[PDB]
Design a protein around this ligand. Structure first.
Ligand code: OO5
Ligand code: OO5
Ligand code: CA
Ligand code: CA
Ligand code: ZN
Ligand code: ZN
Ligand code: ZN
Ligand code: ZN
Lengths: 520, 516
């Protein structure tokens, strides 16, 4: 028997400092969780106790808070080096600043292998990015060797900016030849570390022969064995066991998101590299684990530059602004209503030209905002909600295109995918019992060609003026029908600026869940 | 036979100048209607053509626009004298400024009889007011005499400020002895002119023996025979014929409101004062009738005082603010939503709920004037000078208030509620007191406000006008069952504050009120 402890993080999303338990800015420090200084403490405590330890990242360190807006990846390279990560798989967000935004801040500065077997570079980019990322890495672990094969979501070109000189091959197709190569190199212990979501992770475990453990991200999947330590409801047991097609039991792990937890799985391997047993659970990074003084002091040095921002309050909230994914990707969430009202207000202020409707991919809502901080909302709080630097664009759509967009919003409902829409000037009702593509049972919209605006059934053959983020207007999130069927598209103001000017105009905000979205 | 032409107006409500067709401020003068200068022109044309003419007012000349806010009734006395009205019945709004606000500006200055048979004065007020108003007046009309008996709503002490020295008797009870007295005085032709609403008007016609014609107001009832000239949908034929208990056919007339129409009914009487036939229709006072130059010039002299109010724009509206009664007393109206949002905003800057008697919404606001909203526009919407008060109520009291809101739905009564932070659904097929089928309210004891079914045993913080908080509009359950009542800011100031903060407004009818 040979034992390995896999320590793992995924979807940290610029949460370098300890956060509130919902991962919003830390205010009451005694109840704060996560951060890199606290993570360093737990890792050290496990490394001290266990002989064979790997610390892995399943991607999406990039994009999330003012840490990234300012350091653009340099903070990721620096503090992951400080923590001595053994390997990292590339996430879709690592491409948000293009290949140059990945190469210079992270690929050239990381002292640990960065992996992806399903990303192939072509032509001009190929010679530049040579060995800057790898398909796998064979890591010495004590008297053994462990192979770690990387993978990144197929939909990265539709979620990010990877550019035209990167070919995103199907995960399973690209993984099997890499795993088979490692077997010929007599690497009997194989970890698939990647960023495609829990459903693809279970598929890789099932189909890719020779993979022993799948470590994933992207779906922000919380898995737990027994009674959970916080507010996250588990999606299944930890580890999640997949019975593979070749007749093996393959554990699948994920550690939620935002560095709130440290994934922890102890594996017993046999002489031949097969998993005999696996047990563990994600470790809640709460107050009972102290922040490392050395890392903390270094975080405070790097914080001086973020503090240069105005601590000026854009306004106050008397209600909790629910910007969490388990709300905004599943049902009507008051943060979505606020952003849609900000969108409509911005466009109706300077204007046919009359815009009453708003759509907004819930997945584009990246953080909640707490109201107990005397209700204060600053640019830093807002930048965690809207970090992508997009614009709120004006589009002209047929009712049939909008009916299609709303069918797409729920086409794969239940997987925590980002396409679920938050709305303004629309009253939609879904019936999830119905087959995908026929789930919209009611779709009323606010009339424009009326002196008194009211909700009327959406007409297939009619034309509507919709305010939506540029991401959607450009057919992002699988909304092909918008880019292909739109009749007019006009660029709008910057997303964060639209919301901050609205908050400033309102002074005190109180958005509610009021029935814009219903389920029968 | 002897023919009489009854010309009549009711519920003019300070509409001294010509207005828009919805009775809001006149902007595009070429499409404007009503006003006293135009009314004077039609009256004059009828008077030259017909030998026997009476011009009557069925009350509610008072309260409505900045004309009243400034002139406090003096403008009513002056321009009704100019038009040479033959008689006027007292409306509930004639008491809005108390008895002193009725005595000095109007009663002492009117050159025509002011009537009410069901209002009895007691003690100190009695000796002051003697003969300033009368129960009836016998008017010479050619070689004949016509008796006009007046009446005022029983509900005046609960709608206005008449004071404690005025006893408002039931209309029918007070009318019959007065009509009977006139019969002994050999007055064979009797008109009941009053202000209690169409339903009481039909009742008076039916029960008060000897009344030949009922001229009314208060319900803003539009009656028409044939195809109507404007946007008002008739409530019945003109005149409305009631078969009285003594067997006779009694015509009932009303001329909508705001001086948009002039009521016009020709009556053929027999030598014994019995109506043989009656025919007519309200005359639309549109652009095809010129404003009288003399009255118009005099309106312009009286307008210099109002003009002193700075036309500073509080904000802009990109939508029509529907503040009409046929909307706000029947269903969810975007003006009600705006005022309720202004109410909630004022108090939240935790109170999530708002109720607002639709009858307290007195005018719409047009958006085609480049969207401009001034204090003058707002003063026509909120003319009563009330406050938006904080109240603490049990869910059962609120369920009662919502049952009262629709208890007599269909009569254009003011109690129908406009709401904020409430989602109500009614089923009018159901018996009164059991019409509320859904009542969800915005939670307070929650971090994220959502709509939850109203709990009978729970306590709620509601923002409502002082009028309602003090059990007005028949909302006895509020004054009697409330747990806490706190005075709020002045109604017009709350809304103007809000409009100024929002700059551009766009309220919508969004489903706060539904009908099953
Ligand atoms: O965040 P993970 O990859 O861990 C999982 O969630 C993914 C979801 O987030 C949403 N999303 N993704 C990217 C993206 C975006 N695009 C700019 C331009 C290129 C990158 C940023 N802008 C907006 Cl408005 N929302 C975005 C979207 O709803 C997606 O399904
Ligand atoms: O106007 P008319 O008499 O022709 C017919 O409509 C009557 C309706 O109007 C409403 N109403 N009446 C009076 C009144 C008010 N009271 C102040 C104190 C004393 C006078 C003004 N304040 C408010 Cl918020 N609304 C009021 C109420 O909804 C009533 O049913
Ligand atoms: Ca193996
Ligand atoms: Ca008679
Ligand atoms: Zn992520
Ligand atoms: Zn991702
Ligand atoms: Zn009236
Ligand atoms: Zn009245």
């Amino acid at each position: 028997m040979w034992e390995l402890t896999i320590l793992h993080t995924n979807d940290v999303h610029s949460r370098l400092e300890q956060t509130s338990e919902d991962s919003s800015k830390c205010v009451d420090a005694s109840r704060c969780m996560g951060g890199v200084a606290r993570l360093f403490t737990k890792v050290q405590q496990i490394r001290r106790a266990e002989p064979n330890v790997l610390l892995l990242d399943a991607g999406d360190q990039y994009q999330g808070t003012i840490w990234f807006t300012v350091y653009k990846g340099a903070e990721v390279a620096h503090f992951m080096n400080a923590l001595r990560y053994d390997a990292m798989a590339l996430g879709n967000h690592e491409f948000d600043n293009g290949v140059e935004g990945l190469i210079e801040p992270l690929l050239k500065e990381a002292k640990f292998p960065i992996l992806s077997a399903n990303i192939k570079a072509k032509g001009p980019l190929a010679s530049q990015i040579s060995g800057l990322y790898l398909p796998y890495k064979v890591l010495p672990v004590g008297d053994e060797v462990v192979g770690i094969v990387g993978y990144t979501s197929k939909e990265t070109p539709f979620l990010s900016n990877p550019g035209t000189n990167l070919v995103f091959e199907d995960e399973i197709t690209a993984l099997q030849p890499e795993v088979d190569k490692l077997k010929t190199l007599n690497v009997n212990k194989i970890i698939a570390l990647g960023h495609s979501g829990f459903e693809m992770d279970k598929l890789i475990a099932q189909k890719v022969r020779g993979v022993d453990v799948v470590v994933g991200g992207h779906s922000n999947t919380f898995l737990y064995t027994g009674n959970p330590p916080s507010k996250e409801v588990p999606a299944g047991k930890y580890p999640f066991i997949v019975t593979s097609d070749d007749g093996r039991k393959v554990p699948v792990v994920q550690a939620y998101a935002f560095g709130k937890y440290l994934g922890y799985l102890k594996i017993e391997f046999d002489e031949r590299g097969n998993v005999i047993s696996s047990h563990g659970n994600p470790i809640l990074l709460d107050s009972s684990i102290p922040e490392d003084p050395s890392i903390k002091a270094d975080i405070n040095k790097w914080r001086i530059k973020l503090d240069d921002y105005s601590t000026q309050e854009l306004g106050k909230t008397i209600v909790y602004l629910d910007g969490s994914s388990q709300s905004c990707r599943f049902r009507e969430c008051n943060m979505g209503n606020l952003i849609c009202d900000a969108m409509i207000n911005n466009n109706l202020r300077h204007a046919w030209n009359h815009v009453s409707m708003c759509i907004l991919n819930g997945g584009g809502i990246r953080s909640p905002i707490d109201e107990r901080n005397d209700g204060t909302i600053t640019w830093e709080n807002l930048a965690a909600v809207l970090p992508f630097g997009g614009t709120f664009d004006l589009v002209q759509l047929k009712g049939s295109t909008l009916k299609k967009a709303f069918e797409h919003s729920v086409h794969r409902y239940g997987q925590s995918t980002g396409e679920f829409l938050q709305v303004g000037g629309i009253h939609v009702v879904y019936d999830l019992s119905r087959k995908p593509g026929d789930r919209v049972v009611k779709l009323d919209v606010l009339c424009t060609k009326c002196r008194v605006p009211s909700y009327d059934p959406l007409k297939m053959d009619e034309v509507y003026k919709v305010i939506l983020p540029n991401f959607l207007a450009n057919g992002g999130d699988g909304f092909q029908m918008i880019k292909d069927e739109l009749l007019r598209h006009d660029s709008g103001d910057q997303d964060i600026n639209v919301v901050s000017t609205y908050i400033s105009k309102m002074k005190v905000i109180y958005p509610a869940v009021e029935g814009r979205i219903k389920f029968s």
